[PDB]
Protein backbone atom coordinates (compact mmCIF):
# COMPACT_ATOMS: atom_id res chain seq x y z
CA UNK A 1 0.00 0.00 0.00
CA UNK A 2 1.05 3.67 0.65
CA UNK A 3 4.66 4.44 1.67
CA UNK A 4 4.51 6.53 4.94
CA UNK A 5 6.57 7.31 8.13
CA UNK A 6 5.62 3.80 9.55
CA UNK A 7 7.30 1.88 6.67
CA UNK A 8 10.27 4.32 6.05
CA UNK A 9 13.14 1.79 6.55
CA UNK A 10 11.67 -0.17 3.58
CA UNK A 11 13.22 2.50 1.32
CA UNK A 12 16.74 1.23 2.22
CA UNK A 13 16.23 -2.55 2.08
CA UNK A 14 17.66 -4.73 -0.77
CA UNK A 15 14.41 -4.74 -2.88
CA UNK A 16 15.12 -2.44 -5.87
CA UNK A 17 12.70 0.52 -5.85
CA UNK A 18 12.37 3.86 -7.58
CA UNK A 19 10.69 7.17 -6.68
CA UNK A 20 9.11 8.94 -9.66
CA UNK A 21 8.39 12.67 -9.36
CA UNK A 22 6.58 14.31 -12.33
CA UNK A 23 6.41 17.86 -10.88
CA UNK A 24 8.98 19.31 -13.36
CA UNK A 25 7.82 17.45 -16.51
CA UNK A 26 5.51 20.23 -17.85
CA UNK A 27 6.97 23.65 -17.00
CA UNK A 28 5.58 26.98 -18.32
CA UNK A 29 5.90 30.76 -18.01
CA UNK A 30 2.54 32.65 -18.11
CA UNK A 31 2.51 35.99 -20.03
CA UNK A 32 0.22 38.63 -21.61
CA UNK A 33 -0.20 38.59 -25.43
CA UNK A 34 -0.31 41.72 -27.64
CA UNK A 35 -4.14 41.69 -27.50
CA UNK A 36 -3.98 41.49 -23.63
CA UNK A 37 -4.96 37.75 -23.42
CA UNK A 38 -2.76 35.28 -21.48
CA UNK A 39 -0.60 32.59 -23.07
CA UNK A 40 1.85 29.99 -21.80
CA UNK A 41 5.35 29.25 -23.10
CA UNK A 42 6.70 25.78 -22.24
CA UNK A 43 10.36 25.35 -21.09
CA UNK A 44 12.32 22.07 -20.97
CA UNK A 45 11.34 19.79 -18.11
CA UNK A 46 12.46 16.51 -16.62
CA UNK A 47 11.29 13.29 -14.96
CA UNK A 48 13.03 12.68 -11.64
CA UNK A 49 13.41 8.90 -11.18
CA UNK A 50 15.54 8.03 -8.12
CA UNK A 51 16.74 4.86 -6.40
CA UNK A 52 16.79 5.98 -2.73
CA UNK A 53 19.12 3.11 -1.72
CA UNK A 54 21.90 3.74 -4.25
CA UNK A 55 21.39 7.41 -5.21
CA UNK A 56 21.11 6.57 -8.92
CA UNK A 57 19.07 9.25 -10.64
CA UNK A 58 17.60 8.67 -14.11
CA UNK A 59 16.93 12.25 -15.26
CA UNK A 60 14.84 12.02 -18.44
CA UNK A 61 14.90 15.49 -20.04
CA UNK A 62 11.49 16.46 -21.52
CA UNK A 63 12.21 18.78 -24.46
CA UNK A 64 9.52 21.40 -25.37
CA UNK A 65 9.13 19.72 -28.83
CA UNK A 66 7.07 16.90 -27.19
CA UNK A 67 4.22 19.43 -26.45
CA UNK A 68 4.05 20.80 -30.07
CA UNK A 69 0.48 20.60 -31.37
CA UNK A 70 -0.74 18.63 -28.35
CA UNK A 71 -3.82 19.52 -26.22
CA UNK A 72 -4.53 19.09 -22.48
CA UNK A 73 -0.78 19.26 -21.70
CA UNK A 74 -1.11 18.83 -17.90
CA UNK A 75 -2.97 15.50 -18.57
CA UNK A 76 -0.58 14.42 -21.35
CA UNK A 77 2.44 15.13 -19.06
CA UNK A 78 1.32 12.41 -16.66
CA UNK A 79 0.94 9.80 -19.50
CA UNK A 80 4.28 10.88 -21.09
CA UNK A 81 5.89 10.42 -17.64
CA UNK A 82 4.38 6.92 -17.33
CA UNK A 83 5.46 6.07 -20.93
CA UNK A 84 9.06 7.14 -20.18
CA UNK A 85 9.26 5.28 -16.81
CA UNK A 86 7.85 2.13 -18.57
CA UNK A 87 10.54 2.55 -21.31
CA UNK A 88 13.29 2.94 -18.66
CA UNK A 89 12.13 -0.28 -16.90
CA UNK A 90 12.10 -2.23 -20.23
CA UNK A 91 15.66 -0.86 -20.97
CA UNK A 92 17.09 -2.25 -17.69
CA UNK A 93 18.37 -5.81 -17.40
CA UNK A 94 15.94 -8.01 -15.52
CA UNK A 95 18.09 -8.11 -12.33
CA UNK A 96 18.11 -4.23 -12.26
CA UNK A 97 14.32 -3.80 -12.78
CA UNK A 98 12.54 -2.36 -9.74
CA UNK A 99 10.11 -4.44 -7.66
CA UNK A 100 8.26 -1.21 -6.61
CA UNK A 101 7.73 2.25 -8.14
CA UNK A 102 6.64 4.93 -5.66
CA UNK A 103 4.96 7.99 -7.26
CA UNK A 104 5.17 11.29 -5.37
CA UNK A 105 1.76 12.42 -6.74
CA UNK A 106 -1.33 10.21 -6.66
CA UNK A 107 -2.45 11.47 -10.12
CA UNK A 108 0.45 9.35 -11.54
CA UNK A 109 -1.00 6.04 -10.25
CA UNK A 110 -3.44 5.20 -13.12
CA UNK A 111 -1.14 6.40 -15.93
CA UNK A 112 1.78 4.35 -14.57
CA UNK A 113 -0.35 1.26 -13.78
CA UNK A 114 -1.73 1.21 -17.35
CA UNK A 115 1.77 1.62 -18.92
CA UNK A 116 3.15 -1.16 -16.65
CA UNK A 117 0.44 -3.82 -17.37
CA UNK A 118 3.25 -6.04 -18.91
CA UNK A 119 4.88 -6.02 -15.38
CA UNK A 120 2.15 -7.31 -13.00
CA UNK A 121 4.76 -8.06 -10.30
CA UNK A 122 6.03 -4.45 -10.13
CA UNK A 123 3.99 -2.73 -7.38
CA UNK A 124 2.93 0.89 -8.14
CA UNK A 125 2.52 2.75 -4.82
CA UNK A 126 1.65 6.26 -3.62
CA UNK A 127 3.29 7.87 -0.61
CA UNK A 128 2.07 9.93 2.36
CA UNK A 129 5.61 11.52 2.54
CA UNK A 130 5.81 15.20 1.40
CA UNK A 131 9.02 14.91 -0.60
CA UNK A 132 10.79 17.98 -1.96
CA UNK A 133 11.84 16.53 -5.35
CA UNK A 134 10.22 19.54 -7.15
CA UNK A 135 13.41 21.44 -6.01
CA UNK A 136 15.68 19.18 -8.22
CA UNK A 137 15.89 22.12 -10.63
CA UNK A 138 17.56 24.17 -7.80
CA UNK A 139 20.64 21.86 -8.19
CA UNK A 140 22.65 23.94 -10.66
CA UNK A 141 24.13 21.05 -12.67
CA UNK A 142 20.65 19.42 -13.10
CA UNK A 143 19.00 22.73 -14.12
CA UNK A 144 21.86 23.38 -16.60
CA UNK A 145 21.57 20.01 -18.48
CA UNK A 146 17.76 20.41 -18.69
CA UNK A 147 17.92 23.99 -20.04
CA UNK A 148 20.71 23.28 -22.56
CA UNK A 149 18.92 20.21 -24.06
CA UNK A 150 18.00 20.60 -27.78
CA UNK A 151 16.28 17.11 -27.97
CA UNK A 152 14.98 14.37 -25.66
CA UNK A 153 17.90 13.02 -23.55
CA UNK A 154 18.45 10.70 -20.56
CA UNK A 155 21.25 11.80 -18.15
CA UNK A 156 22.42 9.57 -15.27
CA UNK A 157 23.62 10.96 -11.95
CA UNK A 158 24.38 9.79 -8.45
CA UNK A 159 22.45 12.35 -6.38
CA UNK A 160 24.44 11.33 -3.21
CA UNK A 161 27.89 12.04 -4.79
CA UNK A 162 30.33 9.80 -2.75
CA UNK A 163 28.37 10.10 0.56
CA UNK A 164 27.64 6.30 0.72
CA UNK A 165 31.44 5.83 1.25
CA UNK A 166 30.90 7.36 4.76
CA UNK A 167 27.13 7.20 5.63
CA UNK A 168 24.18 4.80 5.24
CA UNK A 169 21.44 5.14 2.60
CA UNK A 170 19.00 6.18 5.37
CA UNK A 171 21.33 9.07 6.37
CA UNK A 172 22.08 10.05 2.73
CA UNK A 173 18.33 10.22 1.90
CA UNK A 174 17.71 12.31 5.06
CA UNK A 175 20.52 14.71 4.00
CA UNK A 176 19.14 14.89 0.43
CA UNK A 177 15.54 15.64 1.56
CA UNK A 178 16.80 18.29 4.06
CA UNK A 179 18.88 20.02 1.31
CA UNK A 180 16.00 19.89 -1.21
CA UNK A 181 13.45 21.08 1.41
CA UNK A 182 15.75 24.10 2.23
CA UNK A 183 16.20 24.87 -1.48
CA UNK A 184 12.40 24.65 -2.00
CA UNK A 185 11.75 26.92 1.02
CA UNK A 186 14.40 29.68 0.37
CA UNK A 187 16.55 28.88 -2.65
CA UNK A 188 18.80 32.01 -2.38
CA UNK A 189 19.52 31.41 1.34
CA UNK A 190 20.12 27.64 0.83
CA UNK A 191 22.61 28.27 -2.06
CA UNK A 192 24.46 30.89 0.04
CA UNK A 193 24.80 28.29 2.88
CA UNK A 194 26.24 25.73 0.42
CA UNK A 195 28.67 28.08 -1.41
CA UNK A 196 29.53 30.49 1.54
CA UNK A 197 33.11 29.13 2.18
CA UNK A 198 34.96 29.50 -1.20
CA UNK A 199 37.62 26.92 -0.13
CA UNK A 200 34.98 24.07 -0.29
CA UNK A 201 34.31 23.29 -3.97
CA UNK A 202 32.05 20.97 -5.99
CA UNK A 203 34.09 18.31 -7.80
CA UNK A 204 33.61 18.23 -11.59
CA UNK A 205 32.00 14.74 -11.17
CA UNK A 206 29.70 15.82 -8.23
CA UNK A 207 26.48 17.83 -7.64
CA UNK A 208 27.15 19.02 -4.06
CA UNK A 209 30.23 20.49 -2.32
CA UNK A 210 33.03 18.32 -0.84
CA UNK A 211 32.19 18.84 2.88
CA UNK A 212 34.01 16.98 5.65
CA UNK A 213 31.87 15.00 8.14
CA UNK A 214 32.06 17.96 10.63
CA UNK A 215 31.20 20.51 7.87
CA UNK A 216 28.11 18.42 6.85
CA UNK A 217 26.88 18.61 10.51
CA UNK A 218 27.27 22.48 10.40
CA UNK A 219 25.59 22.68 6.97
CA UNK A 220 22.66 20.43 8.04
CA UNK A 221 22.16 22.62 11.18
CA UNK A 222 22.18 25.78 9.00
CA UNK A 223 19.57 24.19 6.65
CA UNK A 224 17.25 23.28 9.60
CA UNK A 225 17.72 26.92 10.90
CA UNK A 226 16.69 28.23 7.43
CA UNK A 227 13.57 26.00 7.30
CA UNK A 228 12.52 27.03 10.85
CA UNK A 229 13.30 30.75 10.11
CA UNK A 230 11.07 30.58 7.02
CA UNK A 231 8.24 28.84 8.92
CA UNK A 232 8.33 31.74 11.50
CA UNK A 233 8.33 34.36 8.67
CA UNK A 234 5.37 32.56 6.94
CA UNK A 235 3.09 32.11 9.99
CA UNK A 236 4.37 35.22 11.99
CA UNK A 237 5.52 32.76 14.74
Amino acid sequence: GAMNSSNYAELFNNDIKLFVDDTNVYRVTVHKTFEGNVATKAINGCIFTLNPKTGHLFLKIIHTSVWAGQKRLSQLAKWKTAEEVSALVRSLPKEEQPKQIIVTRKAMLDPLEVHMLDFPNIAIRPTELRLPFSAAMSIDKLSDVVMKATEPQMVLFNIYDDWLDRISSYTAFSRLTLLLRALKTNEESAKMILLSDPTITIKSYHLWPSFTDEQWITIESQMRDLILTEYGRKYNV
Binding site: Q75, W79, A82, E83, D110, P111, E113, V114, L117, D118
Partner: protein, 300 residues
Protein backbone atom coordinates in the same frame (compact mmCIF):
# COMPACT_ATOMS: atom_id res chain seq x y z
CA UNK B 1 -50.70 -18.73 -21.70
CA UNK B 2 -48.39 -21.22 -19.89
CA UNK B 3 -48.60 -22.54 -16.33
CA UNK B 4 -46.04 -23.47 -13.62
CA UNK B 5 -47.89 -25.69 -11.14
CA UNK B 6 -46.68 -26.35 -7.60
CA UNK B 7 -46.98 -29.76 -5.92
CA UNK B 8 -47.60 -27.91 -2.61
CA UNK B 9 -46.34 -25.08 -0.38
CA UNK B 10 -45.11 -26.75 2.83
CA UNK B 11 -43.18 -23.70 4.14
CA UNK B 12 -44.33 -20.08 4.37
CA UNK B 13 -42.62 -18.08 1.54
CA UNK B 14 -42.78 -14.87 -0.51
CA UNK B 15 -43.06 -16.03 -4.17
CA UNK B 16 -42.00 -13.65 -6.96
CA UNK B 17 -42.94 -14.07 -10.62
CA UNK B 18 -41.09 -11.43 -12.64
CA UNK B 19 -41.79 -7.99 -11.05
CA UNK B 20 -44.83 -9.38 -9.06
CA UNK B 21 -44.90 -10.99 -5.59
CA UNK B 22 -47.37 -12.90 -3.39
CA UNK B 23 -47.06 -14.25 0.19
CA UNK B 24 -47.94 -17.97 0.70
CA UNK B 25 -48.72 -19.35 4.22
CA UNK B 26 -47.25 -22.66 5.59
CA UNK B 27 -49.38 -25.54 4.08
CA UNK B 28 -51.64 -23.03 2.19
CA UNK B 29 -53.54 -24.79 -0.67
CA UNK B 30 -51.36 -23.08 -3.33
CA UNK B 31 -50.71 -24.98 -6.61
CA UNK B 32 -48.99 -22.48 -8.86
CA UNK B 33 -49.06 -19.63 -11.35
CA UNK B 34 -51.16 -19.58 -14.56
CA UNK B 35 -51.59 -17.18 -17.52
CA UNK B 36 -47.81 -16.56 -17.85
CA UNK B 37 -47.25 -14.54 -21.06
CA UNK B 38 -45.61 -16.50 -23.89
CA UNK B 39 -42.79 -14.73 -25.72
CA UNK B 40 -40.54 -13.73 -22.82
CA UNK B 41 -38.18 -15.31 -20.37
CA UNK B 42 -39.55 -15.36 -16.82
CA UNK B 43 -38.12 -15.68 -13.29
CA UNK B 44 -39.87 -17.43 -10.40
CA UNK B 45 -38.20 -16.50 -7.10
CA UNK B 46 -38.44 -17.26 -3.41
CA UNK B 47 -37.64 -15.75 -0.04
CA UNK B 48 -38.47 -17.97 2.93
CA UNK B 49 -40.59 -16.40 5.73
CA UNK B 50 -38.50 -18.05 8.50
CA UNK B 51 -35.09 -17.26 6.88
CA UNK B 52 -34.84 -14.24 4.53
CA UNK B 53 -31.22 -15.50 3.83
CA UNK B 54 -30.86 -16.97 0.37
CA UNK B 55 -33.17 -15.24 -1.99
CA UNK B 56 -33.15 -17.86 -4.86
CA UNK B 57 -35.06 -18.59 -8.08
CA UNK B 58 -35.26 -19.99 -11.60
CA UNK B 59 -35.13 -18.41 -15.03
CA UNK B 60 -37.26 -20.29 -17.60
CA UNK B 61 -39.17 -20.04 -20.87
CA UNK B 62 -42.50 -22.06 -21.07
CA UNK B 63 -41.74 -22.55 -24.85
CA UNK B 64 -38.80 -24.83 -23.88
CA UNK B 65 -40.75 -27.38 -21.74
CA UNK B 66 -43.33 -28.04 -19.02
CA UNK B 67 -41.93 -26.82 -15.64
CA UNK B 68 -43.27 -27.26 -12.11
CA UNK B 69 -42.10 -26.43 -8.56
CA UNK B 70 -41.82 -28.97 -5.74
CA UNK B 71 -40.43 -28.38 -2.23
CA UNK B 72 -37.50 -30.64 -1.21
CA UNK B 73 -37.48 -31.08 2.60
CA UNK B 74 -33.91 -32.48 2.49
CA UNK B 75 -32.28 -29.51 0.69
CA UNK B 76 -34.92 -27.14 2.20
CA UNK B 77 -35.96 -25.34 -0.95
CA UNK B 78 -38.50 -24.99 -3.73
CA UNK B 79 -36.97 -26.77 -6.78
CA UNK B 80 -37.96 -26.35 -10.43
CA UNK B 81 -38.31 -29.60 -12.34
CA UNK B 82 -39.29 -30.52 -15.91
CA UNK B 83 -42.23 -32.89 -16.59
CA UNK B 84 -41.49 -34.83 -19.85
CA UNK B 85 -45.02 -36.51 -19.86
CA UNK B 86 -47.20 -33.86 -21.63
CA UNK B 87 -50.62 -35.51 -20.95
CA UNK B 88 -49.81 -35.99 -17.23
CA UNK B 89 -48.74 -32.31 -16.98
CA UNK B 90 -51.88 -31.07 -18.84
CA UNK B 91 -54.14 -33.15 -16.47
CA UNK B 92 -52.40 -31.86 -13.29
CA UNK B 93 -52.71 -28.22 -14.52
CA UNK B 94 -56.40 -28.73 -15.58
CA UNK B 95 -57.37 -30.12 -12.06
CA UNK B 96 -55.54 -27.26 -10.25
CA UNK B 97 -57.19 -24.60 -12.50
CA UNK B 98 -60.68 -26.17 -12.05
CA UNK B 99 -60.15 -25.99 -8.22
CA UNK B 100 -58.89 -22.34 -8.61
CA UNK B 101 -55.74 -23.23 -6.64
CA UNK B 102 -53.49 -20.99 -8.85
CA UNK B 103 -52.67 -17.24 -8.91
CA UNK B 104 -52.92 -15.50 -12.31
CA UNK B 105 -49.88 -13.63 -13.69
CA UNK B 106 -51.28 -10.13 -13.01
CA UNK B 107 -50.35 -8.38 -16.29
CA UNK B 108 -52.22 -5.07 -17.06
CA UNK B 109 -52.90 -4.94 -20.88
CA UNK B 110 -51.32 -1.39 -21.20
CA UNK B 111 -48.21 -2.56 -19.29
CA UNK B 112 -45.04 -3.31 -21.28
CA UNK B 113 -42.73 -3.25 -18.16
CA UNK B 114 -41.60 -6.88 -18.43
CA UNK B 115 -40.97 -6.74 -22.18
CA UNK B 116 -39.04 -3.47 -21.57
CA UNK B 117 -36.85 -5.14 -18.89
CA UNK B 118 -36.22 -8.35 -20.94
CA UNK B 119 -36.25 -7.07 -24.57
CA UNK B 120 -32.75 -8.51 -25.26
CA UNK B 121 -32.72 -11.41 -22.70
CA UNK B 122 -32.68 -14.90 -24.32
CA UNK B 123 -32.89 -18.22 -22.44
CA UNK B 124 -29.96 -19.59 -24.55
CA UNK B 125 -27.71 -16.69 -23.33
CA UNK B 126 -28.86 -17.18 -19.70
CA UNK B 127 -27.85 -20.90 -19.94
CA UNK B 128 -24.28 -19.88 -20.94
CA UNK B 129 -23.95 -17.44 -18.01
CA UNK B 130 -25.46 -19.99 -15.57
CA UNK B 131 -23.96 -23.44 -16.57
CA UNK B 132 -26.12 -26.53 -15.72
CA UNK B 133 -26.68 -28.13 -19.12
CA UNK B 134 -28.97 -31.00 -17.86
CA UNK B 135 -31.78 -28.48 -17.07
CA UNK B 136 -33.61 -26.15 -19.53
CA UNK B 137 -34.10 -23.59 -16.67
CA UNK B 138 -31.40 -21.71 -14.66
CA UNK B 139 -31.02 -21.40 -10.87
CA UNK B 140 -29.68 -18.10 -9.46
CA UNK B 141 -29.41 -16.96 -5.83
CA UNK B 142 -28.30 -14.01 -3.68
CA UNK B 143 -24.88 -15.54 -2.83
CA UNK B 144 -23.57 -16.82 -6.23
CA UNK B 145 -20.28 -15.10 -7.12
CA UNK B 146 -19.18 -14.11 -10.61
CA UNK B 147 -16.11 -15.46 -12.49
CA UNK B 148 -14.62 -11.92 -11.97
CA UNK B 149 -15.27 -11.93 -8.17
CA UNK B 150 -13.74 -15.49 -8.01
CA UNK B 151 -10.51 -14.33 -9.87
CA UNK B 152 -9.99 -11.50 -7.25
CA UNK B 153 -14.66 -20.37 -5.07
CA UNK B 154 -16.72 -23.32 -6.58
CA UNK B 155 -16.49 -22.67 -10.37
CA UNK B 156 -19.59 -24.88 -11.19
CA UNK B 157 -21.89 -22.48 -9.12
CA UNK B 158 -20.49 -19.25 -10.71
CA UNK B 159 -22.15 -16.51 -12.77
CA UNK B 160 -20.08 -16.53 -16.04
CA UNK B 161 -20.64 -12.86 -16.94
CA UNK B 162 -18.17 -11.45 -19.48
CA UNK B 163 -15.17 -10.05 -17.52
CA UNK B 164 -14.81 -6.24 -17.93
CA UNK B 165 -11.65 -4.69 -16.45
CA UNK B 166 -10.61 -1.17 -17.47
CA UNK B 167 -6.97 -1.72 -16.28
CA UNK B 168 -6.33 -4.96 -18.17
CA UNK B 169 -4.32 -5.82 -21.32
CA UNK B 170 -7.66 -6.75 -22.95
CA UNK B 171 -8.89 -3.13 -22.50
CA UNK B 172 -5.62 -1.36 -23.49
CA UNK B 173 -3.67 -1.77 -26.76
CA UNK B 174 0.10 -1.57 -26.17
CA UNK B 175 1.03 1.86 -27.61
CA UNK B 176 -2.45 3.35 -27.13
CA UNK B 177 -2.37 3.46 -23.29
CA UNK B 178 -3.71 7.08 -22.76
CA UNK B 179 -6.05 6.85 -25.75
CA UNK B 180 -7.68 3.53 -24.71
CA UNK B 181 -7.81 4.44 -20.97
CA UNK B 182 -9.53 7.84 -21.48
CA UNK B 183 -11.70 6.67 -24.47
CA UNK B 184 -13.01 3.08 -24.07
CA UNK B 185 -14.31 2.91 -27.76
CA UNK B 186 -11.68 0.29 -28.81
CA UNK B 187 -12.61 -1.96 -25.85
CA UNK B 188 -16.37 -1.50 -26.41
CA UNK B 189 -16.54 -1.75 -30.24
CA UNK B 190 -13.65 -4.07 -31.25
CA UNK B 191 -13.06 -6.29 -28.18
CA UNK B 192 -16.57 -6.54 -26.69
CA UNK B 193 -19.13 -5.93 -29.50
CA UNK B 194 -17.27 -7.28 -32.60
CA UNK B 195 -15.23 -9.91 -30.66
CA UNK B 196 -17.05 -11.39 -27.67
CA UNK B 197 -20.78 -10.46 -27.90
CA UNK B 198 -20.92 -10.30 -31.76
CA UNK B 199 -23.72 -7.64 -31.63
CA UNK B 200 -25.32 -4.99 -29.37
CA UNK B 201 -28.41 -7.24 -28.73
CA UNK B 202 -26.29 -9.88 -26.89
CA UNK B 203 -24.44 -7.08 -24.96
CA UNK B 204 -27.77 -5.54 -23.86
CA UNK B 205 -29.22 -8.98 -22.97
CA UNK B 206 -26.34 -9.60 -20.55
CA UNK B 207 -26.71 -6.03 -19.13
CA UNK B 208 -30.45 -6.62 -18.63
CA UNK B 209 -29.94 -10.07 -17.03
CA UNK B 210 -27.31 -8.63 -14.63
CA UNK B 211 -29.71 -5.89 -13.51
CA UNK B 212 -32.55 -8.41 -12.97
CA UNK B 213 -30.36 -10.72 -10.85
CA UNK B 214 -29.16 -7.68 -8.83
CA UNK B 215 -32.75 -6.49 -8.24
CA UNK B 216 -34.58 -9.85 -7.65
CA UNK B 217 -31.82 -11.63 -5.60
CA UNK B 218 -29.66 -8.75 -4.24
CA UNK B 219 -26.80 -10.49 -6.10
CA UNK B 220 -23.87 -8.14 -5.53
CA UNK B 221 -21.69 -9.49 -8.44
CA UNK B 222 -24.60 -8.95 -10.80
CA UNK B 223 -24.91 -5.30 -9.68
CA UNK B 224 -21.14 -4.85 -10.35
CA UNK B 225 -21.57 -6.30 -13.87
CA UNK B 226 -24.61 -4.11 -14.67
CA UNK B 227 -22.68 -0.92 -13.70
CA UNK B 228 -19.49 -2.04 -15.59
CA UNK B 229 -21.51 -2.57 -18.82
CA UNK B 230 -23.15 0.89 -18.43
CA UNK B 231 -19.81 2.57 -17.68
CA UNK B 232 -18.10 0.87 -20.69
CA UNK B 233 -20.66 2.49 -23.09
CA UNK B 234 -20.80 5.92 -21.35
CA UNK B 235 -16.94 6.05 -21.23
CA UNK B 236 -16.73 5.49 -25.07
CA UNK B 237 -16.59 8.60 -27.35
CA UNK B 238 -17.71 6.49 -30.42
CA UNK B 239 -21.00 4.58 -29.94
CA UNK B 240 -23.56 3.88 -32.66
CA UNK B 241 -26.60 6.21 -32.31
CA UNK B 242 -29.02 3.22 -32.21
CA UNK B 243 -27.12 1.80 -29.22
CA UNK B 244 -27.19 5.12 -27.25
CA UNK B 245 -30.94 5.51 -27.88
CA UNK B 246 -31.63 1.88 -26.92
CA UNK B 247 -29.44 2.20 -23.75
CA UNK B 248 -31.49 5.27 -22.66
CA UNK B 249 -34.72 3.14 -23.00
CA UNK B 250 -33.16 0.17 -21.18
CA UNK B 251 -31.92 2.22 -18.20
CA UNK B 252 -35.14 4.30 -17.95
CA UNK B 253 -37.27 1.14 -17.41
CA UNK B 254 -34.70 -0.31 -14.97
CA UNK B 255 -34.63 2.89 -12.83
CA UNK B 256 -38.48 3.05 -13.14
CA UNK B 257 -38.89 -0.53 -11.75
CA UNK B 258 -36.25 -0.34 -8.94
CA UNK B 259 -37.89 -0.33 -5.47
CA UNK B 260 -37.35 3.26 -4.14
CA UNK B 261 -36.12 1.77 -0.80
CA UNK B 262 -33.30 -0.39 -2.46
CA UNK B 263 -31.71 2.66 -4.30
CA UNK B 264 -29.01 2.87 -1.50
CA UNK B 265 -27.89 -0.81 -2.12
CA UNK B 266 -28.60 -1.13 -5.93
CA UNK B 267 -27.13 2.19 -7.35
CA UNK B 268 -23.40 3.10 -7.47
CA UNK B 269 -23.05 6.88 -6.86
CA UNK B 270 -19.66 7.13 -8.69
CA UNK B 271 -20.81 5.31 -11.84
CA UNK B 272 -24.15 7.20 -12.18
CA UNK B 273 -22.61 10.67 -11.51
CA UNK B 274 -19.77 9.88 -13.99
CA UNK B 275 -22.20 8.46 -16.63
CA UNK B 276 -24.85 11.24 -16.44
CA UNK B 277 -22.68 14.37 -15.80
CA UNK B 278 -18.94 13.72 -16.77
CA UNK B 279 -18.83 10.99 -19.52
CA UNK B 280 -18.70 11.29 -23.37
CA UNK B 281 -22.41 10.28 -23.24
CA UNK B 282 -23.52 12.76 -20.43
CA UNK B 283 -25.97 14.36 -22.99
CA UNK B 284 -27.09 11.08 -24.72
CA UNK B 285 -29.34 9.62 -21.91
CA UNK B 286 -32.07 12.26 -21.61
CA UNK B 287 -34.90 9.94 -20.40
CA UNK B 288 -32.64 8.21 -17.86
CA UNK B 289 -31.23 11.55 -16.62
CA UNK B 290 -34.79 12.89 -16.13
CA UNK B 291 -36.08 9.84 -14.15
CA UNK B 292 -32.88 9.63 -12.04
CA UNK B 293 -33.07 13.40 -11.17
CA UNK B 294 -36.80 13.13 -10.25
CA UNK B 295 -36.72 9.76 -8.36
CA UNK B 296 -33.17 9.67 -6.79
CA UNK B 297 -31.86 13.31 -6.61
CA UNK B 298 -29.98 12.41 -3.33
CA UNK B 299 -27.69 9.88 -5.14
CA UNK B 300 -26.71 12.68 -7.57
Amino acid sequence: MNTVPFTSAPIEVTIGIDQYSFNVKENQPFHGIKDIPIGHVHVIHFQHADNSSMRYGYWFDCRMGNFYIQYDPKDGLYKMMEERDGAKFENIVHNFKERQMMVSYPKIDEDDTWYNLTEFVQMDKIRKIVRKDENQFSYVDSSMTTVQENELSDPAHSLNYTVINFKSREAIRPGHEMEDFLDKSYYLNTVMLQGIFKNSSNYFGELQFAFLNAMFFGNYGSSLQWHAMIELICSSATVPKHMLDKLDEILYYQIKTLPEQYSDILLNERVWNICLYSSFQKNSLHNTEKIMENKYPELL
